[PDB]
Design a protein around this motif. Structure first.
Motif, short mmCIF file in Angstrom:
data_model
loop_
_atom_site.label_atom_id
_atom_site.label_comp_id
_atom_site.label_asym_id
_atom_site.label_seq_id
_atom_site.Cartn_x
_atom_site.Cartn_y
_atom_site.Cartn_z
N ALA A 181 -1.97 7.45 -2.67
CA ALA A 181 -2.48 6.47 -1.76
C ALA A 181 -3.92 6.21 -2.19
O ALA A 181 -4.56 7.04 -2.75
N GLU A 217 -8.75 9.84 0.34
CA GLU A 217 -7.67 10.55 0.95
C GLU A 217 -8.22 11.74 1.76
O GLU A 217 -9.31 12.18 1.52
N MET A 226 -5.02 16.88 1.54
CA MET A 226 -3.92 16.30 0.74
C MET A 226 -4.40 16.08 -0.70
O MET A 226 -3.68 16.46 -1.66
N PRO A 268 0.80 -1.23 0.00
CA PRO A 268 0.00 0.00 0.00
C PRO A 268 0.84 1.28 0.00
O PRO A 268 1.76 1.42 0.79
N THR A 269 0.49 2.19 -0.90
CA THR A 269 1.23 3.44 -1.20
C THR A 269 0.86 4.53 -0.17
O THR A 269 -0.33 4.61 0.22
N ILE A 270 1.84 5.34 0.22
CA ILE A 270 1.59 6.63 0.92
C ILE A 270 1.59 7.74 -0.13
O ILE A 270 0.56 8.40 -0.27
N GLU A 271 2.69 7.87 -0.88
CA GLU A 271 2.80 8.79 -2.04
C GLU A 271 4.12 8.46 -2.74
O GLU A 271 5.15 8.39 -2.05
N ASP A 272 4.10 8.31 -4.05
CA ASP A 272 5.33 8.05 -4.85
C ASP A 272 5.26 8.85 -6.15
O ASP A 272 4.17 8.93 -6.74
#
Ligand SMILES: Nc1nc2c(ncn2[C@@H]2O[C@H](COP(=O)(O)OP(=O)(O)OP(O)(O)=S)[C@@H](O)[C@H]2O)c(=O)[nH]1
Ligand SMILES: [Mg+2]
Lengths: 166, 93
Positions: free
Chosen positions: A59, A63, A67, A34-38
């Motif tokens: 993500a 959200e 953000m 699972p992504t937070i932010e990339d």
């Protein structure tokens, strides 16, 4: 060199990261992280025109408003991703689009609807429903598999064409 | 693994109420993932819940079927991204 700020949005687990990594690094990530932010940046040639793709892999939705509003304000085009085995991911698309339109103050935002995981047998969202939704918005619809690469390059390049033609 | 003590606290033939113990750090959000036990890559569904939750309802399940449920915690700390290993359980029905 022209830069395109692309933002990939959708519910958790639909394949946003796998689709991004397939486009940028040409391999399939089978692990679920699972992504937070990339962010990903890559110089490509699309229809003979050199550009930099700056892709924000977000993500999963929903959200936090503060953000989400930041990347919806800076994004030039949106890949709105659902999974064909997740009816909730499909139903949530409408409100993701409404939020992008509100932040942009425009009903004409470069966007592509992506139905991902088209390699799976047991689908719960029909192509007809998704095609009808995309047509109601006046945006392209494409079914993808990050696993097999079906539709992946077409989806992102289609989004760049939507930005160029806006 | 984070969080700890993942359990089904109530079940119906089509739904599970799950509960877990929050860590003693601020969590931005949790991902709840569920599919049939032994499912292939991508053959699952997931949804996000805020970091303030320690319970979730999973709905639309098939009666008499073995499911694997996985919870991930995500956030930030002084150390950088908070990406602990998930916790999983199996439950039938
Ligand atoms: N079979 C199949 N599996 C896929 C496909 N796309 C992604 N997956 C798998 O599903 C899982 C979730 O994909 P991932 O790209 O991590 O989701 P995400 O949308 O980024 O999830 P998040 O970061 O918002 S919580 C991964 O295990 C990935 O390998 C696909 O087209 N087919
Ligand atoms: Mg991701």
């Amino acid at each position: 060199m022209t830069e395109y700020k692309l933002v990939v949005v959708g519910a958790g687990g639909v394949g946003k990261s796998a689709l991004t990594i397939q486009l940028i690094q040409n391999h399939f990530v089978d692990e679920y992280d699972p992504t937070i932010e990339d962010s990903y940046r890559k110089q490509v040639v699309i229809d003979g025109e050199t550009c930099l793709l700056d892709i924000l892999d977000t993500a999963g939705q929903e959200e936090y408003s503060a953000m989400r509003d930041q990347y919806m304000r800076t994004g030039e085009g949106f890949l709105c991703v659902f999974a064909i085995n997740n009816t909730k991911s499909f139903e949530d698309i409408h409100q993701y689009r409404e939020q992008i339109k509100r932040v942009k103050d425009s009903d004409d935002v470069p966007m592509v609807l992506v139905g991902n995981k088209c390699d799976l047998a047991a689908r719960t969202v029909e192509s007809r429903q998704a095609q009808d939704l995309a047509r109601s918005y006046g945006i392209p619809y494409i079914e993808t598999s990050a696993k097999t690469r079906q539709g992946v390059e077409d989806a992102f390049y289609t989004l760049v064409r939507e930005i160029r033609q806006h | 693994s984070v969080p700890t003590k993942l359990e089904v606290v109530a079940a119906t033939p089509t739904s599970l109420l799950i509960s877990w113990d929050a860590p003693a750090v601020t969590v931005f959000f949790y991902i709840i993932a569920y599919g049939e036990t032994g499912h292939g890559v991508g053959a699952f569904q997931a949804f996000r819940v805020p970091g303030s939750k320690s319970t979730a309802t999973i709905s639309g399940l098939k009666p008499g079927v073995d499911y694997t449920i996985t919870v991930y915690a995500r956030g930030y700390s002084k150390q950088g991204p908070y990406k602990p290993s998930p916790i999983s359980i199996n439950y039938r029905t």
